Amino acid sequence: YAKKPHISALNAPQLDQRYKNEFTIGAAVEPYQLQNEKDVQMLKRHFNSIVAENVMKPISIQPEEGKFNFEQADRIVKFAKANGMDIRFHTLVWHSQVPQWFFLDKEGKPMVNETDPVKREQNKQLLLKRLETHIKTIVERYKDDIKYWDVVNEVVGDDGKLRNSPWYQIAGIDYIKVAFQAARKYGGDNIKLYMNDYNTEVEPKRTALYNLVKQLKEEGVPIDGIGHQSHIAIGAPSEAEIEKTINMFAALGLDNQITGLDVSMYGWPPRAYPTYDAIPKQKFLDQAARYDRLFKLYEKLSDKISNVTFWGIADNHTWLDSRADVYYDANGNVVVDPNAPYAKVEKGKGKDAPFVFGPDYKVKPAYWAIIDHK
Ligand SMILES: O[C@@H]1[C@@H](O)[C@H](O[C@@H]2CO[C@H](F)[C@H](O)[C@H]2O)OC[C@H]1O
Ligand SMILES: [Cl-]
Ligand SMILES: [Cl-]
Ligand SMILES: [Zn+2]
Ligand SMILES: [Zn+2]
Ligand SMILES: [Zn+2]
Ligand SMILES: [Zn+2]
C-alpha cells in the first residue's frame, strides 16, 4: 500500500521473520558492506541467508594456480555464522570471472587452439583435474559452514544449446559432471548442490535446462536443486510462466532457490533514468504490484522453494546500474521511450531501483506489498 510510510527499514517489521516458515530471505553482499553500519543493521534485521556478490567467484578465489585468496570469503562466512545466517557459495564453476590459467596447455597456449585429438584429450583431462583441485580446496575449507552451493553457473546457452564456453569446448559435458561429483566427494552428503542460471523460464533454455539435469541425475551425477537468478522486469516473465518453471523442476525432485532476485524498473535493453530522484512515483507502484504478485506466487509454491535471495541489500547498490544505459536525443533530453528517437547513449550511467528498500534505507512501496498478508 502507498499510504504506508517511508519509514526506516531498521524500524520496519523484519522481512525474514515474515517468511520464516516458507523460505529463507537472503541478500548478495560485498565485504566492504560488513564495514558499513547501515548494511550491518539491514542484514541483521531483515535477512537470514547470505551470498557473496563477488569474492567467492573463480577469479576471486584462485587468480593464479596455487594462489588461494580466502580472506574476503572468510569475512562473509564469519559474519553469517556470527548472526546465524545460511550461506550460499557463488559459484564453483563459471564462464565469467574465471582466470585464464585454467584453459592453457603445458606450453601455455589456449587449449581451445589445439587441433591434435591426442593433445585435445590431454588438455581435457588437465582441465578436469584443475577443476577438481579448485573445487577440492574450496569445499574442504567450507564444507561445515556453507550449506548451499552453486556448483555450476550459466552453463546452458540461451539458444537452447549448452553454452560453448572454454569449459565446454575443452572438456565437453564432462566438466559439468566432474563439477558436481567433486563437490559431493569432498563436502559429503550434507551440503546441497545446485545448478544456477538466468532466464530459467524462457524457452528453448528452460526445457534445455530440464533435459540436462534430468539426464545427469539419471546418470547418478549429484545435483540437488535449481537456482533461478530471476533478473526480471515489472511485466516479464509472467507469474504464470514462473510457476510453470518452478513446477517443472520440482517434479524431478529438485529444490528451487530464487538466487539473484531483482525487479527492474526498465525493459530490454534498458532505457534508464539518469538518477534515482528522476524515476516517477508511479513506477514504484508498478514495481510494488509485481512484487506482491511475485511473492504471493512464491508463498503458494513454498513447498517447492527453500530460499529467496535478492541480488543486493538496498537500492543504493545494485549491479543493475551497470546495465542502466541512458539515452539522449539531439537536444540532450533523456529518452526512456523504448522506440523513440535519440542520438547518443551513455552506457551504465543510469540508476535502477530493484529492491524493496530505497537508497536511504527507508521502506519502499514494494516492501509493504510483500510484508503484509494480502
Ligand atoms: O558486481 C558485479 C556482480 O554484481 C555481478 O554478479 C552477477 C550478476 O548476474 C548473475 F546473477 C550472476 O550469477 C552474478 O555473478 O557480476 C559482475 C560483477 O562485476
Ligand atoms: Cl555491482
Ligand atoms: Cl528515496
Ligand atoms: Zn532474523
Ligand atoms: Zn555490486
Ligand atoms: Zn527516501
Ligand atoms: Zn501481499
CSV table of all heavy atoms in Angstrom, one decimal, residues 6-10 12-15 25 42 46-47 276 287 291 310 312-316 353-367 370:
chain,number,residue,atom,x,y,z
A,6,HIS,N,7.2,5.8,4.4
A,6,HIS,CA,8.6,5.7,4.0
A,6,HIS,C,9.5,5.6,5.3
A,6,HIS,O,10.5,6.4,5.4
A,6,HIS,CB,9.0,6.9,3.2
A,6,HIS,CG,10.2,6.7,2.3
A,6,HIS,ND1,10.6,5.5,1.9
A,6,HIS,CD2,11.1,7.6,1.8
A,6,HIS,CE1,11.7,5.6,1.1
A,6,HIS,NE2,12.0,6.9,1.0
A,7,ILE,N,9.2,4.7,6.2
A,7,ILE,CA,9.9,4.7,7.5
A,7,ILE,C,11.2,3.9,7.3
A,7,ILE,O,11.4,3.1,6.3
A,7,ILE,CB,9.1,4.0,8.6
A,7,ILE,CG1,8.6,2.6,8.1
A,7,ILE,CG2,7.9,4.9,8.9
A,7,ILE,CD1,8.1,1.8,9.2
A,8,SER,N,12.1,4.1,8.2
A,8,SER,CA,13.4,3.5,8.1
A,8,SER,C,13.3,2.0,8.2
A,8,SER,O,12.4,1.4,8.9
A,8,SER,CB,14.3,4.0,9.3
A,8,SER,OG,15.5,3.3,9.3
A,9,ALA,N,14.1,1.3,7.4
A,9,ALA,CA,14.0,-0.2,7.3
A,9,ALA,C,14.6,-0.8,8.5
A,9,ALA,O,14.2,-2.0,8.8
A,9,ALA,CB,14.7,-0.7,6.0
A,10,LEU,N,15.4,-0.1,9.3
A,10,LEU,CA,15.9,-0.6,10.6
A,10,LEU,C,14.8,-0.7,11.6
A,10,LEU,O,14.9,-1.3,12.6
A,10,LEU,CB,17.0,0.3,11.1
A,10,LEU,CG,18.0,0.6,10.0
A,10,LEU,CD1,19.0,1.6,10.5
A,10,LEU,CD2,18.6,-0.6,9.3
A,12,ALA,N,11.4,-1.2,10.4
A,12,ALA,CA,10.3,-1.9,9.8
A,12,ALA,C,10.2,-3.3,10.4
A,12,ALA,O,11.2,-3.9,10.8
A,12,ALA,CB,10.5,-1.9,8.3
A,13,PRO,N,9.0,-3.9,10.3
A,13,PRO,CA,8.9,-5.4,10.7
A,13,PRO,C,9.9,-6.2,9.9
A,13,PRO,O,10.0,-6.1,8.6
A,13,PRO,CB,7.4,-5.7,10.4
A,13,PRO,CG,6.8,-4.3,10.5
A,13,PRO,CD,7.7,-3.3,10.1
A,14,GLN,N,10.5,-7.2,10.5
A,14,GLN,CA,11.6,-7.9,10.0
A,14,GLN,C,11.2,-8.8,8.8
A,14,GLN,O,10.3,-9.6,8.9
A,14,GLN,CB,12.3,-8.8,11.0
A,14,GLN,CG,12.9,-8.0,12.2
A,14,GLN,CD,12.0,-7.9,13.4
A,14,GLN,OE1,10.8,-7.8,13.3
A,14,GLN,NE2,12.6,-8.0,14.6
A,15,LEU,N,11.9,-8.7,7.7
A,15,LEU,CA,11.5,-9.4,6.4
A,15,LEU,C,11.7,-10.9,6.5
A,15,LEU,O,10.8,-11.6,6.1
A,15,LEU,CB,12.2,-8.8,5.2
A,15,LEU,CG,11.6,-9.3,3.9
A,15,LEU,CD1,10.2,-8.7,3.8
A,15,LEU,CD2,12.4,-8.9,2.8
A,25,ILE,N,15.2,-15.7,3.5
A,25,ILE,CA,15.3,-14.4,2.8
A,25,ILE,C,16.8,-14.0,2.8
A,25,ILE,O,17.3,-13.8,3.9
A,25,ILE,CB,14.4,-13.3,3.4
A,25,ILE,CG1,13.0,-13.8,3.6
A,25,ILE,CG2,14.5,-12.0,2.5
A,25,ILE,CD1,12.3,-14.2,2.3
A,42,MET,N,20.9,-3.6,8.4
A,42,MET,CA,20.0,-4.2,7.4
A,42,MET,C,20.1,-5.7,7.4
A,42,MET,O,19.0,-6.4,7.4
A,42,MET,CB,20.3,-3.6,6.0
A,42,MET,CG,19.7,-2.3,5.8
A,42,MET,SD,17.9,-2.1,6.1
A,42,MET,CE,17.3,-2.8,4.5
A,46,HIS,N,16.9,-8.0,8.7
A,46,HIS,CA,15.9,-8.4,7.8
A,46,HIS,C,16.2,-9.7,7.1
A,46,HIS,O,15.3,-10.3,6.4
A,46,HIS,CB,15.7,-7.4,6.7
A,46,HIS,CG,14.8,-6.2,7.1
A,46,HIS,ND1,13.6,-6.4,7.6
A,46,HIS,CD2,15.1,-4.9,7.2
A,46,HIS,CE1,13.1,-5.3,8.0
A,46,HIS,NE2,13.9,-4.3,7.8
A,47,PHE,N,17.5,-10.2,7.1
A,47,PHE,CA,17.8,-11.4,6.3
A,47,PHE,C,18.4,-12.5,7.2
A,47,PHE,O,19.0,-12.3,8.3
A,47,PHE,CB,18.8,-11.1,5.2
A,47,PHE,CG,18.5,-9.9,4.4
A,47,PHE,CD1,18.8,-8.6,4.8
A,47,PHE,CD2,17.9,-10.1,3.1
A,47,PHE,CE1,18.4,-7.6,4.0
A,47,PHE,CE2,17.5,-9.0,2.3
A,47,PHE,CZ,17.8,-7.8,2.8
A,276,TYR,N,18.3,8.5,-9.3
A,276,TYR,CA,17.2,7.9,-8.6
A,276,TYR,C,16.0,8.9,-8.4
A,276,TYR,O,14.9,8.5,-8.6
A,276,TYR,CB,17.7,7.5,-7.2
A,276,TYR,CG,16.8,6.5,-6.5
A,276,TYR,CD1,17.0,5.1,-6.7
A,276,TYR,CD2,15.7,6.9,-5.7
A,276,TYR,CE1,16.1,4.2,-6.1
A,276,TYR,CE2,14.9,6.0,-5.1
A,276,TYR,CZ,15.1,4.7,-5.3
A,276,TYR,OH,14.3,3.7,-4.7
A,287,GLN,N,6.1,-1.4,-9.6
A,287,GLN,CA,7.0,-2.4,-9.1
A,287,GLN,C,6.4,-3.1,-7.9
A,287,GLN,O,6.6,-4.3,-7.7
A,287,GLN,CB,8.4,-1.7,-8.7
A,287,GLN,CG,9.4,-2.7,-8.4
A,287,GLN,CD,10.6,-2.0,-7.7
A,287,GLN,OE1,10.4,-1.2,-6.8
A,287,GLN,NE2,11.8,-2.4,-8.1
A,291,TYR,N,5.9,-7.1,-7.1
A,291,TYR,CA,6.5,-7.8,-6.0
A,291,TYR,C,5.4,-8.6,-5.2
A,291,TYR,O,5.6,-9.7,-4.7
A,291,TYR,CB,7.2,-6.9,-5.1
A,291,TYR,CG,8.7,-6.8,-5.3
A,291,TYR,CD1,9.3,-5.7,-5.8
A,291,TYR,CD2,9.5,-7.9,-5.0
A,291,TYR,CE1,10.7,-5.6,-6.0
A,291,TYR,CE2,10.9,-7.9,-5.2
A,291,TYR,CZ,11.5,-6.8,-5.7
A,291,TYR,OH,12.8,-6.7,-5.9
A,310,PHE,N,17.8,-11.8,-2.8
A,310,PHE,CA,17.9,-10.6,-3.6
A,310,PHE,C,19.3,-10.4,-4.0
A,310,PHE,O,20.3,-10.7,-3.2
A,310,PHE,CB,17.4,-9.3,-2.9
A,310,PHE,CG,15.9,-9.4,-2.5
A,310,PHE,CD1,15.5,-10.0,-1.4
A,310,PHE,CD2,15.0,-8.7,-3.3
A,310,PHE,CE1,14.1,-10.0,-1.1
A,310,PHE,CE2,13.6,-8.7,-3.0
A,310,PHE,CZ,13.2,-9.4,-1.9
A,312,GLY,N,21.2,-7.9,-3.8
A,312,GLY,CA,21.7,-6.7,-3.2
A,312,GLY,C,20.9,-6.5,-1.9
A,312,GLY,O,20.0,-7.3,-1.6
A,313,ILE,N,21.3,-5.5,-1.2
A,313,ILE,CA,20.6,-5.1,0.1
A,313,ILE,C,19.6,-4.0,-0.1
A,313,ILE,O,18.4,-4.1,0.3
A,313,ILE,CB,21.6,-4.7,1.2
A,313,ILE,CG1,22.7,-5.8,1.3
A,313,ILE,CG2,20.9,-4.5,2.5
A,313,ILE,CD1,23.6,-5.5,2.5
A,314,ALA,N,20.0,-2.8,-0.7
A,314,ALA,CA,19.2,-1.7,-0.9
A,314,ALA,C,19.5,-1.0,-2.2
A,314,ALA,O,20.6,-1.2,-2.7
A,314,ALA,CB,19.2,-0.8,0.3
A,315,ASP,N,18.6,-0.1,-2.6
A,315,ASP,CA,18.7,0.5,-3.9
A,315,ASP,C,19.9,1.3,-4.2
A,315,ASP,O,20.2,1.7,-5.3
A,315,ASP,CB,17.4,1.4,-4.2
A,315,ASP,CG,16.2,0.6,-4.6
A,315,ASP,OD1,16.3,-0.7,-4.9
A,315,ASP,OD2,15.1,1.2,-4.6
A,316,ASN,N,20.7,1.6,-3.1
A,316,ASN,CA,21.9,2.4,-3.3
A,316,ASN,C,23.1,1.5,-3.8
A,316,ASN,O,24.1,2.1,-4.2
A,316,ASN,CB,22.3,3.0,-2.0
A,316,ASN,CG,22.6,2.0,-0.9
A,316,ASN,OD1,21.9,1.0,-0.8
A,316,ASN,ND2,23.6,2.3,-0.1
A,353,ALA,N,16.2,0.7,-9.6
A,353,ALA,CA,15.6,0.7,-8.3
A,353,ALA,C,14.9,-0.6,-8.1
A,353,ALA,O,13.7,-0.7,-8.1
A,353,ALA,CB,14.7,1.9,-8.1
A,354,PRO,N,15.7,-1.7,-7.8
A,354,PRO,CA,15.1,-3.1,-7.9
A,354,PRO,C,14.7,-3.7,-6.6
A,354,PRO,O,14.0,-4.7,-6.7
A,354,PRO,CB,16.3,-3.8,-8.6
A,354,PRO,CG,17.5,-3.2,-8.0
A,354,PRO,CD,17.2,-1.7,-7.7
A,355,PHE,N,15.0,-3.2,-5.5
A,355,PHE,CA,14.8,-3.9,-4.2
A,355,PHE,C,13.6,-3.3,-3.5
A,355,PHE,O,12.9,-2.5,-4.0
A,355,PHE,CB,16.1,-3.8,-3.3
A,355,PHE,CG,17.3,-4.3,-4.0
A,355,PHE,CD1,18.4,-3.5,-4.1
A,355,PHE,CD2,17.3,-5.5,-4.7
A,355,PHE,CE1,19.6,-3.8,-4.8
A,355,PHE,CE2,18.4,-5.9,-5.4
A,355,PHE,CZ,19.6,-5.1,-5.4
A,356,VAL,N,13.3,-3.8,-2.3
A,356,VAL,CA,12.1,-3.3,-1.6
A,356,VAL,C,12.6,-2.3,-0.6
A,356,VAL,O,11.9,-1.9,0.3
A,356,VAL,CB,11.4,-4.5,-0.9
A,356,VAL,CG1,10.9,-5.5,-1.8
A,356,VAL,CG2,12.3,-5.1,0.2
A,357,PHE,N,13.9,-1.9,-0.8
A,357,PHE,CA,14.5,-0.9,0.1
A,357,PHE,C,15.1,0.2,-0.7
A,357,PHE,O,15.9,-0.1,-1.7
A,357,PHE,CB,15.5,-1.6,1.1
A,357,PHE,CG,14.9,-2.6,2.0
A,357,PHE,CD1,15.3,-3.9,2.0
A,357,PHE,CD2,14.0,-2.2,2.9
A,357,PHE,CE1,14.8,-4.9,2.9
A,357,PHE,CE2,13.4,-3.1,3.8
A,357,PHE,CZ,13.8,-4.5,3.8
A,358,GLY,N,14.9,1.4,-0.3
A,358,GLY,CA,15.4,2.5,-1.1
A,358,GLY,C,16.7,3.0,-0.6
A,358,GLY,O,17.1,2.7,0.5
A,359,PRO,N,17.5,3.8,-1.4
A,359,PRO,CA,18.9,4.1,-1.1
A,359,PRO,C,19.1,4.8,0.1
A,359,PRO,O,20.3,4.9,0.6
A,359,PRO,CB,19.3,4.9,-2.4
A,359,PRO,CG,18.1,5.4,-2.9
A,359,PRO,CD,16.9,4.5,-2.6
A,360,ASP,N,18.1,5.4,0.8
A,360,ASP,CA,18.2,6.0,2.1
A,360,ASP,C,17.8,5.0,3.2
A,360,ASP,O,17.6,5.4,4.4
A,360,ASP,CB,17.3,7.3,2.1
A,360,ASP,CG,15.8,7.0,1.9
A,360,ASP,OD1,15.4,5.9,1.7
A,360,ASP,OD2,15.1,8.0,1.9
A,361,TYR,N,17.6,3.7,2.9
A,361,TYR,CA,17.3,2.7,3.8
A,361,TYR,C,15.9,2.8,4.5
A,361,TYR,O,15.7,2.4,5.6
A,361,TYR,CB,18.4,2.6,4.9
A,361,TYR,CG,19.8,2.1,4.3
A,361,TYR,CD1,20.6,3.1,3.7
A,361,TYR,CD2,20.2,0.8,4.2
A,361,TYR,CE1,21.8,2.7,3.1
A,361,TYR,CE2,21.3,0.4,3.7
A,361,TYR,CZ,22.2,1.4,3.1
A,361,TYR,OH,23.4,0.9,2.5
A,362,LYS,N,15.0,3.4,3.8
A,362,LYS,CA,13.6,3.5,4.2
A,362,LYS,C,12.8,2.7,3.2
A,362,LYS,O,13.1,2.5,2.1
A,362,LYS,CB,13.1,5.0,4.1
A,362,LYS,CG,14.0,5.9,4.9
A,362,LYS,CD,13.6,7.4,4.7
A,362,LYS,CE,14.6,8.3,5.3
A,362,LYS,NZ,14.4,9.7,4.9
A,363,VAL,N,11.7,2.1,3.8
A,363,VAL,CA,10.9,1.1,3.1
A,363,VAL,C,10.2,1.7,1.8
A,363,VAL,O,9.7,2.8,1.9
A,363,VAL,CB,10.0,0.4,4.0
A,363,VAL,CG1,10.7,-0.1,5.2
A,363,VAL,CG2,8.9,1.3,4.4
A,364,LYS,N,10.2,0.9,0.8
A,364,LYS,CA,9.6,1.3,-0.5
A,364,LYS,C,8.1,0.8,-0.5
A,364,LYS,O,7.7,-0.1,0.3
A,364,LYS,CB,10.4,0.7,-1.7
A,364,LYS,CG,11.8,1.2,-1.8
A,364,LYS,CD,12.5,0.5,-2.9
A,364,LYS,CE,11.8,0.6,-4.3
A,364,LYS,NZ,12.7,0.0,-5.3
A,365,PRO,N,7.3,1.2,-1.5
A,365,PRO,CA,6.0,0.6,-1.7
A,365,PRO,C,6.1,-0.9,-1.9
A,365,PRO,O,5.2,-1.6,-1.5
A,365,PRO,CB,5.6,1.3,-3.0
A,365,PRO,CG,6.1,2.7,-2.9
A,365,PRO,CD,7.5,2.5,-2.2
A,366,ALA,N,7.3,-1.4,-2.4
A,366,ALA,CA,7.4,-2.9,-2.6
A,366,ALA,C,7.5,-3.6,-1.3
A,366,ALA,O,6.9,-4.7,-1.2
A,366,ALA,CB,8.6,-3.2,-3.5
A,367,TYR,N,8.2,-3.1,-0.3
A,367,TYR,CA,8.3,-3.7,1.0
A,367,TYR,C,6.9,-4.0,1.6
A,367,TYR,O,6.7,-5.1,2.1
A,367,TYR,CB,9.1,-2.8,2.0
A,367,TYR,CG,9.0,-3.3,3.4
A,367,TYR,CD1,9.7,-4.3,3.9
A,367,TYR,CD2,8.1,-2.6,4.3
A,367,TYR,CE1,9.7,-4.7,5.2
A,367,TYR,CE2,8.0,-3.0,5.6
A,367,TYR,CZ,8.8,-4.0,6.1
A,367,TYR,OH,8.8,-4.5,7.4
A,370,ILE,N,5.0,-7.0,0.1
A,370,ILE,CA,5.3,-8.3,0.4
A,370,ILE,C,5.3,-8.6,1.9
A,370,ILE,O,5.4,-9.8,2.3
A,370,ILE,CB,6.7,-8.8,-0.2
A,370,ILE,CG1,7.8,-8.1,0.4
A,370,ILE,CG2,6.7,-8.5,-1.7
A,370,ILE,CD1,9.2,-8.6,-0.1
